[PDB]
Write a protein that binds this ligand. Structure first.
Ligand SMILES: [Mn+2]
Ligand SMILES: [Mn+2]
Ligand SMILES: [Mn+2]
Ligand SMILES: [Mn+2]
Lengths: 290, 291
């Protein structure tokens, strides 16, 4: 009467959520080529030199983050997470990062900017100290993951949630700010698709992190919260300097800072933690950008 | 040390952007093909035909899982270049998110749960399937950081899987597909096979890049490695083939198909064909030429 036991298939749920994330991720599949970009040519031409500079640099910072999330972050987390369906979701998310998201920025650059300006902005990412610091910190945690060591994995998942749900947002602000004013709307459409993806990526990785956290003693949990909050504050302080560096020339630094604090709270919530920053009024233009 | 962003406005090689395009435009999902109508031809096959099909299918499934969990991600890890890593990530995604779900769907349609579990138990213990699966996995596990020789050897193993080892298995679904039997699952298999073909060609070009950076003595040594590996896999394929196909009388023709695909795998690695040219079973050809 006994049966022969199941061989890792697709009808069997590994958990309560992976299948629905799998379906959501694959149904959200897109390519930048679906969006024609020549319609932004005039609203781009009309921006001040300061505005164009900030815009290029903002997207370049995003490109760097997605490059490392696709090359390193998502594949390494996929390697250490158990279960073929969980791995399939993480592999799909990894593909989106570098094959779709990172590439879309080049589609935008190639439309709006001459080659020399494109070359210069990629040189600028290499030498920018805030962008290098944030990459160093995030990638360092990814590369510190030890096989069968759930704590090192948790730390990298916190880093990934902070990249998905917090760090992208100093960059996302500006395309959204323009979209909300009816400017650069084709580029803005691409960015909204990227943002829609990152929101579900941050939730999913957050749920995996909570799984590991929930296995710990109360004492260990207290240390993990310390790690998460210390890391958030360290990233936050660096992001403030990055934000000022980019946005002071367009007069928006204070507004962007409010936006990144808002999203920091969302990252904490994705990790099952209470909000850390007090609520503030976000620019309604950016809210219309959503 | 210095972290740089992917810049798709420039080429890092002669071929990666072209393969990127071909890969993403071939994107598909299991749900697109309705499978239930296969039961109308499945019920008319003999026990040996159903048995061979199940065993072949499980063989393909098991090998493709290794490629999704290890083969593609390990190569993506050691290859330098943002655009190459992106293409390789896309290929790994297809293995895990598309191909694996597609094989599962075919199984769930044709067999009850208990039968699926038993077939996988059998194929998991099978000597010829295990020999080739572990030979390939062994080479993936032997890649060393910053050692392009070990990477090349793994790429050769990967090309042999994509362009050669799958084909003793693909034969049967293509054979049915060419006869008007199991058309829905045959369409799925044809899409999978079309992905593996481009995977094999792409990884082959990455291997040739490494090969071309070597001295003449080192090249001769890498050629000997590739031919020796091919020979080991080929001799096991002949045994694998007789084990599965003698009961349905097809082994002679399957062997011709293996050699023909071995030659394609070698050409993907920039090497000369090893086997004399042979004609292929016209029913299988009719299956292959569909689309
Ligand atoms: Mn992304
Ligand atoms: Mn993401
Ligand atoms: Mn496959
Ligand atoms: Mn493949």
């Amino acid at each position: 009467m006994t049966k022969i036991y199941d061989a890792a298939n697709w009808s069997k749920h590994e958990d309560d959520f992976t299948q629905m994330f799998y379906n959501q991720n694959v149904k959200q599949f897109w390519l930048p080529e679906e969006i024609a970009l020549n319609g932004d040519l005039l609203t781009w031409k009309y921006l001040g030199k300061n505005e164009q500079d900030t815009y290029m640099k903002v997207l370049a910072g995003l490109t760097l983050l997605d490059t490392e999330q696709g090359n390193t972050g998502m594949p390494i987390v996929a390697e250490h997470v158990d279960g073929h369906q969980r791995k399939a979701v993480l592999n799909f998310m990894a593909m989106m990062e570098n094959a779709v998201h990172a590439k879309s920025y080049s589609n935008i650059f190639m439309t709006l900017a001459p080659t020399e300006t494109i070359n210069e902005v990629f040189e600028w990412v290499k030498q920018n100290k805030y962008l290098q610091k944030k990459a160093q910190m995030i990638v360092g945690l990814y590369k510190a993951i030890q096989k069968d060591d759930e704590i090192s994995l948790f730390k990298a998942m916190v880093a990934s949630v902070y990249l998905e749900s917090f760090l992208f947002y100093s960059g996302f602000y500006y395309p959204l700010y323009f979209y909300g004013q009816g400017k650069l709307m084709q580029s803005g459409e691409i960015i909204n698709l990227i943002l829609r993806d990152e929101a579900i990526h941050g939730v999913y990785v957050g749920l995996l992190a909570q799984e590991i956290y929930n296995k710990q003693t109360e004492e260990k949990k207290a240390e993990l919260r310390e790690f998460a909050i210390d890391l958030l504050n360290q990233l936050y302080e660096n992001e403030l300097e990055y934000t000022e560096d980019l946005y002071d020339q367009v007069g928006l630094s204070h507004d962007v800072k409010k936006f990144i604090r808002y999203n920091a709270n969302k990252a904490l919530m994705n990790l099952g933690f209470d909000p850390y920053f007090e609520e503030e009024d976000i620019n309604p233009i950016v809210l219309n950008g959503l």
